[PDB]
Amino acid sequence: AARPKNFGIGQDVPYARDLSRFMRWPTFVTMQRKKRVL
RNA sequence: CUGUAAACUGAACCAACGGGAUUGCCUCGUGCAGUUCCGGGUCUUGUUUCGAGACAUCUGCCAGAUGGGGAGUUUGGCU
Ligand SMILES: [Mg+2]
Ligand SMILES: [Mg+2]
Numbered sequence: 007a008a009r010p011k012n013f014g015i016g017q018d019v020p021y022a023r024d025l026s027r028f029m030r031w032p033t034f035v036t037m038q039r040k041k042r043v044l
Numbered sequence: 045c046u047g048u049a050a051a052c053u054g055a056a057c058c059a060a061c062g063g064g065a066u067u068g069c070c071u072c073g074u075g076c077a078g079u080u081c082c083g084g085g086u087c088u089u090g091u092u093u094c095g096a097g098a099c100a101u102c103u104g105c106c107a108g109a110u111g112g113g114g115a116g117u118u119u120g121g122c123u
Contacts, residue, residue: 008062013084017051019059021084028092036091043090 013020 012050
C-alpha cells in the first residue's frame with residue numbers, strides 16, 4: 007500500500023529537492039542578477 | 045494567536061513513491077499500457093547563508109611622529 011517517508015528534519019533522506027536558489031551559479035549568472043538588483 | 049520543525053537513554057538502519065490527471069486498451073463499471081502534477085507551501089523586483097556596514101578593514105593617497113629593523117657614509121691635524 008502506502009510507504010510514508012517523512013522528509014522532516016533529520017528523519018529521512020529527502021528526494022531531489024530543487025535547490026536552484028542556494029546553489030553556486032556560474033559567475034555571469036549571479037553577476038547579471040546582482041546587476042539588475044543593484 | 046501565527047511561527048517549515050512528524051527523530052534514541054553506554055555503538056541497529058533510513059537513498060529512485062501514494063494518489064489524481066492525460067492517451068488509447070479486455071471500454072466507458074473494473075483494468076493493462078506511455079505520460080503529468082500533488083505532497084513527501086505559493087510566489088519571490090531578489091544578495092548563496094549569516095555578521096559588520098558607509099564604520100571599517102584597509103583600496104589609493106599624502107602628512108606627522110616613531111623607526112640600528114635596515115642602508116649609505118663618516119669617525120680631523122699634531123706628535
Ligand atoms: Mg561578469
Ligand atoms: Mg673610529
